[PDB]
Design goal:
- Chains C, F: It comes from Human enterovirus D68.
- Chains C, F: It is found in: Host cytoplasmic vesicle membrane; Host nucleus; Virion.
- This is part of a larger assembly, with 1 copy of chain A (about 130 residues), 3 copies of chain B (about 220 residues) and 2 copies of chain C (about 200 residues).
- Chain B has 2 helices and 11 strands; from the N terminus they run E-E-E-E-H-E-E-H-E-E-E-E-E.
- Chain B is mainly beta.
- Chain C is mainly beta.
- Chain C has a single domain, classed as Jelly Rolls, CATH 2.60.120.20.
- In chain C, the strands form 2 sheets. In chain C, strands 1, 3, 6, 7 and 9 form a 5-stranded antiparallel beta sheet that branches.
- The longest helix of chain C is centred in the N-terminal third of the chain and has 7 residues, at about 40-50.
- The chains are: A mainly beta (about 130), B mainly beta (about 220), C mainly beta (about 200).
- Chains in contact: A-B, A-C, A-D, A-E, A-F, C-D, C-F, E-F.
């Protein structure tokens, strides 16, 4: 996200890794759906399982990679508009034993894939001094 | 377990069950319908008698299968069912995940047949009233004559049954006739020292080798 | 034979005046800004609107005229701000020392400043005509492709404020080059009513 | 002229027009959309100025194309247009069936751009206000620089224009941007001794080689 | 994990991390220093923000390395770091064991630089005040650009990072300049139903390929 | 493919403004002195602080603007004083005729003065970040490597004192070249508080 804001036009596939950081015996199922650009973000678990989704049992698999297909980025602006959504719904409940904490956590990662590309270099809008002459 | 734009990234991908030793093949119009349809999870408790889903009635209003069912007129499909029941190592209980061909139900203590509303339940499916007789006068004890799997939570948490085309006819009406009934009966009830033990069971039904006629 | 003069490379590559604007000099807040398009002058507009799609590199020549209201020798900056970057709103903004915007620093006494702007579209050609809407809703503007915006040419006087006051006329000459052209169109027979659209009076 | 479950069983299958000498090929998801969509017939009379349809706006609410347009997000298609104008041997008149790339319209006697409602007309299409300038300030006389056909009712009654993908981009938004405008302008007006001569014109648009992205 | 007269007889010897794909080699005076120095264990709790150790400052007063540091004058060494975090299967939490080259710290809400006492902490190391910005204005989220490992207590309990010589110079002053900062930040905090959960983290630093000059 | 625009040679080699200072002219004692670093402007500071070690040659362009408080034609000297040499403290010191310091004598009317400063470190790269102390005792300064000091750029007006008084704005443009870069770092998310250090407010 930061190195792309040095460039104007990005294009490529992203990947999202989600990592489950609960206890060893915490079980459950999530459903990570991917919404393509222009489509609307789902609000129900049933609408999410009708799209491109994945049914992730984190009962023993505590990592899921979600490949986001090739976008072309700056081709969808009228100001960047909408590039899609990755949502997550509960499928089951979180099933923990009584000695594990009942609150578990997910962390998510994102990298770009090898077909990612950046062009037309600009300045970063992120940065906008005390103490040589 | 990756069909279509759907995927089940589970772990313990144990042995599956070809029903009657048969794999679903095409009949010698056909990626859209061949995908997992993960139903809503049911809550298995200590007082659960069982759950059933009739096929393809559990899929006749869902997605690219339920569109084609209500636009076409004949269908021919097998089914891949993946039942997964995620619990801890402190839970116990056995499920009989049995797939029944032509499970004509019967009603209890009346001579009137079951109605349309008692049979065609949809994605919610039903609940066994008398699971010991399988709600049809027979027996649960002999129900392992059907294509079945066991989920002993001590041993395994998932069950996969691969169903072929079970019909006397080459194609069939999806809105009229159900051919398979996925039934999940807890033979040994659920148990851990909390009394409100509530293990979830997840049912994913992928219709394999769907054919259609009469758009 | 004689066909080499009606080549589209020869038909279109002429350094025509695309922008002439004066700006003053005292304490567009006293600088030049021009959105690089081609619809400013109807003689060049009608030649490029003989086609549907164009793909050219632009060759901007900047010709600075000074006249005091004894001519001083002054440094000008001419910064190309592409679509995605931020233009100056003032003469002394921080956008004039952008590291990434292509600036050129030139004098009045010099030969005119000449730079080549590349092909800047995200598509393979500029849509001269666009039968479409820019916004994703009904409030969008008709005939405007968001892909086709070149950028802006921002010209200021680098020097700080002086006692004399003068007028700086900036003539911009654009020669398109490496012209490829697709799908020719009928010439416009009616006068133009606006630069935004193809409206016609009769 | 037989695409999909549609068919045009006409007779005088005369010469067609590949637009700019190009046939629609696929770009190196793809029977459902590749079919003729026969629009509602227009009535050509003695006072007709002309008719236009923007593509794919004339098809964005019709059938398996208009479903995929409103479910996907990028499209890429050519078009096969068959205009047929059936009359007797006592009718007269010439039509210019011209297909215009990027027909950015202009409004008349105002400086305000045409709105969304003035441009996106759908299956009904529009009517030329000033067909002599092609409703964009140019000329009808030079409009044979575009891919065109003639329908002289003395000579022929039909016209087929085969349109490729005309875009600077590889794919495109169907609900935002129109790429072809099929225009049918009566150059010589209609005539037979009855004054209420009302010859029908039928437009059939088959979207060839449709691709899509972003379901 | 057996260097010198030291040995770590752990069990789950998982994958290590060569930092930037580089193994420590000698530069083309050299068993005494090449040994594991097991630091004092830190207590990871639910309110922990993180721990850091600067290298070789964490070893400049320990053993045959800290003798040679204070007798010589130039050094050149890689490092083998083994972080191990032993907990039960009822604990949860993720650590980012990240090794930062040239981690110039910054102070919070002042324009005065950090002093000698704020930077050179020794075997005790330090504690992150603001681990979200890595105590230097950047970000913890992008800190996986550095050589790092994860300790998800669900998955693994140990992390090994092999650090080469990171310097613009061929040798360096050990008492002046630190080259690596081992940082251990709990990204997901610790959790088991007792509130006073106190999982230990053990850091063992073996200086690999030590060279020296200027006795 | 497209990877040749995110090359570090292309990512970093842009002639960005590194120093803009005016100085006056009457009887920094009326001359320009700038310690050649890169932390003056936060747009260039944040790009180079995406890395741990850098090795570049600098390409200093000096752009002189004059304005009298009728512009005269004046000679300027721009002397690079490396680390080890002595800088001027006055406009008319003896250090302006150093035989060994690299001076460049240029006019206002000329094209801008451009010199290339080589790689000046005693190590193989400049430490952008330095987790160390410069002094051999505890009173040393944190984050300052003595090896990484480029030198100073001292600019004066060679001409002796004139009747008119004017302001000389000196814009310095540095383009790093032959960039090698090592060990990338996270970008800075908080604002800078000082050029001496990496302190942060929140």
């Amino acid at each position: 996200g930061n190195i792309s804001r040095y460039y104007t036009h990005w294009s490529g596939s992203l990947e999202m890794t989600f990592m489950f950081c609960g206890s060893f015996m915490a079980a459950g199922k999530l459903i990570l759906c991917y919404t393509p650009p222009g489509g609307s973000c789902p609000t129900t678990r049933e609408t999410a399982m009708l799209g491109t989704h994945i049914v992730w049992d984190f009962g023993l698999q505590s990592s899921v990679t979600l490949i986001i297909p090739w976008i072309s980025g700056s081709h969808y602006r009228m100001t960047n508009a909408n590039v899609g959504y990755v949502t997550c719904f509960m499928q089951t409940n979180l099933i923990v034993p009584s000695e594990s904490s009942d609150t578990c956590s997910l962390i998510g990662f994102i990298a770009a894939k090898d077909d990612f590309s950046l062009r037309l270099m600009r300045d970063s809008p992120d940065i906008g001094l005390h103490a040589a002459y | 377990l990756k069909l279509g734009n759907s995927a089940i990234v589970t772990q313990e991908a144990a042995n599956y069950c070809c029903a009657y030793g048969e794999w679903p093949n095409y009949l010698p119009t056909q990626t859209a319908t061949d995908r997992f349809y993960t139903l809503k999870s049911v809550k298995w408790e200590t007082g659960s008698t069982g759950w059933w889903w009739k096929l393809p009635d559990a899929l006749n209003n869902i997605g690219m299968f339920g569109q084609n069912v209500q636009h076409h007129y004949l269908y021919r499909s097998g089914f891949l069912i993946h039942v997964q029941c995620n619990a801890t190592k402190f839970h116990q209980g056995a499920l009989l995940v049995v797939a029944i061909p032509e499970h004509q139900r019967g009603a209890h203590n009346t001579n009137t047949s079951p109605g349309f509303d008692d049979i065609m339940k949809g994605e919610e499916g039903g609940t066994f009233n008398h699971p010991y007789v399988l709600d049809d006068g027979t027996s649960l004890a002999c129900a392992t004559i059907f294509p079945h799997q066991w989920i002993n939570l001590r041993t395994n948490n998932s069950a996969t049954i691969v169903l072929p085309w079970m019909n006397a006819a080459p194609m069939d009406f999806p809105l009229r006739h159900n051919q398979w009934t996925l039934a999940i009966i807890p033979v040994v009830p659920l148990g851990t020292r909390t009394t409100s033990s509530m293990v979830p069971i997840t049912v994913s039904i992928a219709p394999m080798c769907c054919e259609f006629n009469g758009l | 034979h004689g066909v080499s003069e009606t080549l589209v490379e020869n038909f279109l590559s002429r350094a025509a005046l695309v922008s002439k604007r004066s700006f003053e000099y005292k304490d567009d807040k006293n600088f030049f800004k021009w959105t690089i398009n081609t619809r400013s002058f109807v003689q060049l507009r009608r030649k490029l609107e003989l086609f549907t799609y164009l793909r050219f590199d632009a060759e901007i020549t900047i010709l600075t005229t000074v006249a005091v209201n004894g001519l001083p020798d002054l440094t000008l900056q001419a910064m190309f701000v592409p679509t995605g970057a931020l233009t100056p709103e003032k003469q002394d903004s921080f956008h004039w020392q952008s590291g990434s915007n292509a600036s050129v620093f030139f004098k009045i006494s010099d030969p005119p400043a000449r730079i080549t702007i590349p092909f800047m579209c995200i598509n393979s050609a500029y849509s001269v005509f666009y039968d479409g809407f820019a916004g994703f809703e009904k409030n969008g503007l008709y005939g405007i492709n968001p892909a086709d915006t070149i950028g802006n040419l921002c010209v200021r006087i680098v020097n700080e404020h002086q006692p004399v006051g003068f007028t700086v006329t900036v003539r911009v000459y654009m020669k398109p080059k490496h012209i490829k052209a697709w799908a020719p169109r009928p010439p416009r027979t009616l006068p133009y009513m606006s630069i935004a659209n193809a409206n016609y009076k009769g």
